[PDB]
């Protein structure tokens, strides 16, 4: 506020959205993480991969908040909500669910970025560019070539062991 | 399920409410740590220890979740309540509501062991002792002796700079 | 008995029968571990995995009889009763094999636990979840992860053959 | 001119007005840095502070020389205006112009940014939003956090003497 | 006995009583040491200052206890009296404390000093000036330093952190 400058209530209020969405996808992970460890499911490397997402999104979540501050606004929290299921099913059906919450991260950064630009913020725009666009542009390839090779998998009991050992 | 033994099902859905809380304390102290990372706040050695405190009360749920499924037990998992506080005021404030959270999450540890003693279930006894109880404890007296020592400082801008320079 | 001091005669006698049943379960490993490195059967990995176990179990019941000792007990043996089956089937029966047999010692360890709390004998509380309950409690979850695994593995002969080569 | 391409000449010109801009910006610094070294007001730490801001300003200032070099602009240099005081009074009046200071060269980026956009030149768009908005950015936020440290301080006279040796 | 050289029984006797003195001094610092560890009192670097001094009076009975065995004297023991406060109030209470209880340790060294003169015994003497009289020499002048500074620095509750913080 003494140090705030072209910063706008709107973009403010965005950043602060998109903090809870990056929570929310940190907290599905942690979920997915946790069903793959299930005794019953047991595929670890997939639970492995759930789990590093599931500290990537935290951690942008703490870039926004680190921007939002260094702007001069102010962080703002809501409840986060509990992940869509309980159960994941298949590696398949993770995959799917996790390409899913990934393109709807990515949309949400899409708008920000467009709000950006109408109120004429580079820093915004030059801040999601640098650390968020390209990061889900690859992350969102990963999960496409995960789930190609999946489906050519799945005999699906052997393909889902068989792409968890030599893939994940 | 085919591993679970001697695990009821009253310390299965106390140990997913334990999850809960204990994410829901790294959420508050996301909170608190960004809250004096603010440019009209500005406290960097009050920041990082709340964060720290964020990143343990997350290491915390994760032990929780692991020995959940290393006991057959399923994880199951709730909204993460928005914290108590959107602004936290001054370090004294603050170091006082993070006592409090600790007395209630060190509580909610006592009640949990009651319940596994009742049960018969020494696993989870030696667990929490082995990973929590001593650990909250340490943590609680730390967090008192640092009241102690904000209040006897608190000339109260100048109290809380060199508390944050000198202890933090 | 010059040192013996709050160490019951149940628990002595229960101390020497938790021996027996981890002598018990090191010659069924080494009776499951040389099955699997017959030439009809010829799965290394396997037979690896049981020799380990073989050589843990006997560990545990050194643990036991050094303890028994410290406490002023007297070891005292019986015969070694010889293993259930002669020739062990496949992995999946083999797991399944094993797994019941971790269930019945940890049942032991539990009774002993329930008998040591009854004696109001801290000790020997102590010594078994330090030492014994969290071991088993990891190897059954590594256990019902492994027979998992075999199941949705299970072309049988395809799956045996690559579950002994790219998990164990 | 054999090289220039898409290179206008309001972008041209408004360069060489920001090149003015940052050298009078770090010309300012030299002023203050040497007002904290007077035998009167010593104050090392504060000197220090500033003297590295003179360098910064004057390396932002051959950084853009440079790019209208690449560009194929012609430099073009005009008087360096004096600083605006003789004597800075005291941490907090110099850290306040300091920021006066910052948010005035930040508000010029962003009018060359928008005639940019305006002109459609992304190479100047890019050039800027990484090497000078985000720099930009993060000194101001730094600022703010230094004044509000030294407002909660200022018994000004001690207050100022533990900012310089414990901050800065 | 068969050593026993030159050696009165009055200079044991009052080796005996030196021995219990320091012995009580170290209590005394224990207790001293413990007060600064409360959580209402938390001033670590004055709970480290009394353990170290604690550790200083043991060792110091040791070299006595050496030195009566050394010279065929017989070493007994009495019981070891209680601190004088169950609490030490303030680190100034503490410190006058701290340099009363020196005193009356120097004043009995000079004493013994003054008995192994008149006995005509050079060892004791030599013994006495080589081990004991300029360390507490030494460290009355470390106490009465600090007890200046704590007097100078009491805004008391400030005072008391910075010298906490500073000197200790």
Redesign the interface.
């Given at each position: 506020?003494?140090?705030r400058?072209?910063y706008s209530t709107e973009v403010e209020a965005a950043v602060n959205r998109l903090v809870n969405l990056y929570?929310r996808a940190s907290?599905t992970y942690?979920?997915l993480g946790?069903?793959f460890?299930?005794?019953?499911?047991?595929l670890?490397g997939v639970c492995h991969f759930f789990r590093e997402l599931a500290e990537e999104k935290?951690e942008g979540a703490?870039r926004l908040?680190?921007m939002?501050?260094?702007?001069?606004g102010?962080?703002?929290?809501?409840?986060?909500?509990?992940?869509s299921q309980?159960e994941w099913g298949t590696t398949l059906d993770a995959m799917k669910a996790a390409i899913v919450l990934e393109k709807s991260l990515n949309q949400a950064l899409l708008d920000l970025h467009a709000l950006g630009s109408a109120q004429?913020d580079?820093?915004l725009?030059?801040?999601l560019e640098s650390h968020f666009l390209d990061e889900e542009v690859k992350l969102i390839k990963k999960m496409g070539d995960h789930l190609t090779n999946i489906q050519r998998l799945v005999?699906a009991?052997?393909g889902?062991?068989?792409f968890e050992?030599?893939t994940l």
């Open positions: 506020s003494q140090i400058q072209n929570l907290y942690l979920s946790f069903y460890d299930r005794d019953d499911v047991a670890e935290r703490e908040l680190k939002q501050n260094q702007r001069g102010r962080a703002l929290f809501q409840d986060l909500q509990k992940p309980d004429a580079p820093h725009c030059d801040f005999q009991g052997l889902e062991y068989l050992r030599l």
